[PDB]
Amino acid sequence: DKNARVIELIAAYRNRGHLMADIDPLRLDNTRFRTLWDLDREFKVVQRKKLRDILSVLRDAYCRHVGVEYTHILEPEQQRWIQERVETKHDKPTVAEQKYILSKLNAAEAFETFLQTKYVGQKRFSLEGAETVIPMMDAVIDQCAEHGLDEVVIAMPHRGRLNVLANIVGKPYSQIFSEDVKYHLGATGTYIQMFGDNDIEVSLTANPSHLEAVDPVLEGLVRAKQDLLDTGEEGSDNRFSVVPLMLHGDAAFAGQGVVAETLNLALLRGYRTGGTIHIVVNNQIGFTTAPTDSRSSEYCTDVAKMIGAPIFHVNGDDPEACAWVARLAVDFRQAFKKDVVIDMLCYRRRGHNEGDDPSMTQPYMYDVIDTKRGSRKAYTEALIGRGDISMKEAEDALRDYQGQLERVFNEVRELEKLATAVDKAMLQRIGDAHLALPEGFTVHPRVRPVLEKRREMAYEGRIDWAFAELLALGSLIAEGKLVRLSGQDTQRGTFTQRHAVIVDRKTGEEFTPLQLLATNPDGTPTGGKFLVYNSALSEFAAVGFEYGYSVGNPDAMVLWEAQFGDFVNGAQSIIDEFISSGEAKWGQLSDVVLLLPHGHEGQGPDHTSGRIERFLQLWAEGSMTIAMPSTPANYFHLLRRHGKDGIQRPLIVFTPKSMLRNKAAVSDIRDFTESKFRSVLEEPMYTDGEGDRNKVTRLLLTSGKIYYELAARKAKENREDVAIVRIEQLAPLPRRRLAETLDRYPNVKEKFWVQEEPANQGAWPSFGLTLPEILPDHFTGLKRISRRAMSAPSSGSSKVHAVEQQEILDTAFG
Amino acid sequence: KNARVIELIAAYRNRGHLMADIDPLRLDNTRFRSHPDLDVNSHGLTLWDLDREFKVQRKKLRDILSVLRDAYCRHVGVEYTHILEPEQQRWIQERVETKHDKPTVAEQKYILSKLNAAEAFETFLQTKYVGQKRFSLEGAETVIPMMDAVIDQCAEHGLDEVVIAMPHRGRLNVLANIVGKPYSQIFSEDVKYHLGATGTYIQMFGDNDIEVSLTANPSHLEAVDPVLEGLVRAKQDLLDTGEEGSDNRFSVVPLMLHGDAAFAGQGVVAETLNLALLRGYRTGGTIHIVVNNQIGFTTAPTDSRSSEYCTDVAKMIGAPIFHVNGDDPEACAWVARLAVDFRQAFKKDVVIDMLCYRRRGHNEGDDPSMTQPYMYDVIDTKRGSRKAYTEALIGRGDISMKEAEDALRDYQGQLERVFNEVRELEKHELATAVDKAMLQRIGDAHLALPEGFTVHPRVRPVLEKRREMAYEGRIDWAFAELLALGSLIAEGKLVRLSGQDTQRGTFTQRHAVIVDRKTGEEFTPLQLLATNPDGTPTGGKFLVYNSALSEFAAVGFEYGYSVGNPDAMVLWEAQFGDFVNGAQSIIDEFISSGEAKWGQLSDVVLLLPHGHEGQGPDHTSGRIERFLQLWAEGSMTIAMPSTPANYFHLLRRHGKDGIQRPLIVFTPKSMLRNKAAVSDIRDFTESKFRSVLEEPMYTDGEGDRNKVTRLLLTSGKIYYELAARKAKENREDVAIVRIEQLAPLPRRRLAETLDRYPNVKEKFWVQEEPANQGAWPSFGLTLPEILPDHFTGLKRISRRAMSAPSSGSSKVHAVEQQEILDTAFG
């Protein structure tokens, strides 16, 4: 019965020992810590060891300065791996390793002392009380270099950022302190091993003040780099040689939903990066808020249990345990290609900002902090107290600090066009690819007519929207471009129109027809690739990832598709903080494409609008391209121009739903082979037909699918006095092309902007103000024909929709 | 040997769920092969050991193993050893590891009756109407007797209400067979899949009843999750149950339904779970039911999540998780009742993962064998839950051939009743001013400290300055806010105020809660106003909390709270208005549009610190232009007050007008401490809210309105800078008019004020925000149309159009600020 009580004791330490570990350097919770003859008896564990030695191994491993959470991991081999490395008696670090960790603590503290002394308003960014994160990050990067990896990419909030730039990225003081925006900009550097012969690239990504919003952006950036190096999921090796190193705060990590959304991507085929190293700077405070008001779990890291990640809670006043846990984390990530979370328990020495006396809201915590000596002073005293360094060396370490402090002060003192048309053979090849099935492949009987109709369209014309899209993407791959397309149910298409990936009816094997265009007819690679995935049910993390992918590989054609444009508001922080504004704020460029299914069809307020008015409001000084094409060929030329123009700026496309199957919304072969993108479109009766522009007295200006309904109504009552002009590119406004087009209708007495969207929505709120100002001689007196202003994108009734739709058409021809 | 048994017991308790027969489709064939953790020989035990008695009590290994396999490896997969509380693990362990008595024929027939009613509802829906395939509950009808068991167990505990939140799948079935709404109400004259509902559940075999309600929601999956919590917490606060109540029953239960792909992918799930035990947000535990049909439209679970289960996020708060086979309605009803008992015993969330399937395509244009041929060849060989359960009861000898025929007659009768009832239906088809003594009382309250309380030395001058302000005037913004909230509590109103660092204030200005310098005890001065001077309660209360670092779940919760208690004054404060875009879905889908779409009314207040001060693009704008764009047909009130007294009257009008519509307030940062931005006692005691404000030199001074030839129209703090510049140059030819209420535009008040300046030759809208931001994009178009005789020729003075709310440089901000001021006086 005694040997059974030992087995239960071993399991208790492994499962719950972390609840008794001395992880808090402030020891705020006192309640945390609240036979002898058997201790010298040998037990079978098959090895023979004395109970006192088994128990000492269990206390050192699980109840010392490291709290290990791993028995929640479903993989027995991963539990076994941790168990073996944590439960073995490790050899104490060498005097050289201790002196090295100490120099890193000196550099970090001197940097902090310099920041608060030289400049004013720097208290918010203070890393004082959390300096151990610097030798911890150093150990992460050094262990990644020891595995021979290519790059470590960092994402972090603002606390200690300039310290990371100087002591991790290795940026010189002259570059750091030159003129805050500096706390949001990206950076690149080279890490050179101190005791090794390896080097590794280290980069820091740009981010807003919005905590954790950069998390899926880092993942996308890293995946794009991993794809370029041919490493990982889409590569020839399983090394995933680009490592994401993600920094967090404790209140942010537990409260922001994007954390869970980004963790949810960790093992997905379209989003995995081979595991992220997470470091939580757990100072047990969020501004003035205590952890008991910030989370409903024991640890701020408990969300990471969602993906069975091992969690290490470590005492920030023990830099050796912190460096050891950082190296173990890199080894686990390398061995299992899964996320590791390091929870660094520390404190925030100063107030949150200049106007904060933290004892006002946390008197107890700050009476304990005011008793604490720095983790530098503590570690140097601890090295003297254990006899690991001499009195001369301890003075030298103290003199290393002074020289590090003097150096910053003295260095900062010293400082003080292309064609998008393809040939008919290119169209024919993309059409033929849909029927070039692998041997023994069984196409689903309802998919086979789609493949046959695409080979017919490629040779005979009447090209629909869905095929035009694949013609654009396919021709880019054939030219050597990497095309990454993703979104909810994007492989088949929400409207069963895409079939980018087709599934074997008998085996379930996937076949990608456009991937055949990555190989030239002679069998040589084009250098191009088609990467198409079904995303998780996320908007915030998925849009963030695709923006990040566009930044990681500026040469890639990156498209994200919303199920319906109505759901993109779930990614509003990414749209506001990165996509629309990254270039102006940080000089960070993104070529990301957002495909937003849009249009009034009676399917309700959440299946009608991509909120065109919101994107037009965000636009300024050529920041993005915003388009609503009405024709398959014009969409094809829009995608090819974006993929070939070399302008790294986002593209927002309001794509159709029912217009995908509108038989009037088809294009001729010549529209792809002898044309280009047209920002302004006239009716074909005036450009190709026998229509007379001089009979026109009423001009209707519009965009999107409503054109076909207006055109049908004009044809039904032969209204030669009315002309319909489409604005395909909403932003930047094609001022030049718009003026030249309207000049061709000299007898126009009235002009109307016609739209399906309510008066406070669509293009009218911006066009109604801009068009009379930009073109006063053409648009003074411009009137609106639309739905009435609504507090929702549309009515919930399809009957109300139909009445309103007819009301617009009747007003336009009244 | 005894050690190998202890390891075997732990293995079943920890990992037995990985071998449980939970999938009714049995898609993964490798699931039952290769499981050494649970294997006897893989632990160092033989067939000889099976008849040996072990200490666990003394029981044979064979009995230990039969108890473990029945409890953890049959149709229920139990995850609970991740729970840090040993008493919670032991509670589950005892109830799961005991041999339960088989359900009575009466209970079995009742479960079969609920499946009969659910399948008959689903059969009518697909047969009578077209375009109903997307709402089909076919393959998941066991969720109806499962929900019935939840509600019946809540009634058995004597609870007051169950509030349901769910996506659209099986919604009308829930309305008919759970909420109990009649078919005449359900199928009269879709929006019906988004509307709220209330009903009464009456126990079948009991004498208790319980209220059952369904909340309104958009098509945005999981967005309603925090809204349900807020709504339920508001109801708990009214019933004096829960966290802010004398009874610890939490007698209003949230029943939250989910889909498997959405539960794993939506971040709002984790944000809402994170609220579960917070003093300001806890609802005594939510019962979660995931309708896990192992598909999300055309997407397989392996592309939807990075974990074994769609429910693994719930481990974040140490919630017990039950994976149950949807083809076993008895195990499903049993797990539902156990979930209610756990929630009652520990006031924590329970998650039920119901494994089932989706019989049809996702919608009308879906042949799901196109994308999932294997799954759908397996679904095609499966007969429904009702039929399979009828056949099981037959084999077990629990019912006879006559009884099964009678159950099929019950199904036919339920199916005829829908068709018939719908056939018949088709055939017939205020003053806001307070007395000075009220102000003095709120001022005195700041110094009426509890005996032995130690005020922080930096907080004491704030308390003393508030008593001086209350008696002498020069009332600042921060105190005016508390004067408004305090006077409402004194009148009997419930005031709920929350947000990031809201107790102290982001700008160290509020001090709604003060903390004892020696003990950490909290003291709320405004809570003293809930008691009249005679000692009787006013009926009012002050509920003030620091929120978690969430925008989406926190704004969702506060919107839900205003719906749950329409009589409450509910305010949510952003740290900076720049971070409210994290809650855009709640703003777009509930706040701005809930009234027009569902008839659901909300009185929620959003306080959004706003203003250009050189702190960068994320500490400058609450995006006024976005709220003005969302506004239509008086859906919300949008204001930017420039004065403490005008803010006070704005909050009191909102709290007393009886108009259940949201209020959006763009609040100050540096203007909190602007010494010109103070109000007199008479502004609170003898005035009201002013939507349009003139300069005091014209209304109270010796200023001449007839000398004015240039009129500057503006809003917010820039008024003080424009006023200082006018005073500096003695510019009598320029007048500054403020628009305090941006939406609905005060058309009449604006027209009457401008008519008082007859010699105006030019008008300008002046703003700090870029030309594509602030009020200009809407005012520039609206003002010349609504008031053509006053605003034709209206010009803009602002910052240039920008792709961000401001520049990152405070030097660039300062130059642009001066440029605006010089253009206005050029």
Ligand SMILES: Cc1ncc(C[n+]2csc(CCOP(=O)(O)OP(=O)(O)O)c2C)c(N)n1
């Ligand atoms: C999405 C978002 N919400 C709110 C804020 C405002 N904010 C800035 S710092 C802070 C508290 C941060 O707490 P924590 O994550 O523990 O980091 P710490 O400052 O302690 O390192 C908040 C709420 C923000 N920057 N982002």
Ligand SMILES: Cc1ncc(C[n+]2csc(CCOP(=O)(O)OP(=O)(O)O)c2C)c(N)n1
């Ligand atoms: C936030 C959001 N994003 C996307 C959609 C579009 N959408 C509707 S149903 C669906 C798949 C749902 O999967 P699941 O949660 O498993 O539910 P099920 O339809 O299987 O019951 C999606 C992505 C949505 N309604 N909401």
Ligand SMILES: [Ca+2]
């Ligand atoms: Ca481009």
Ligand SMILES: [Ca+2]
């Ligand atoms: Ca109101």
Ligand SMILES: [Mg+2]
């Ligand atoms: Mg913190």
Ligand SMILES: [Mg+2]
């Ligand atoms: Mg599903």
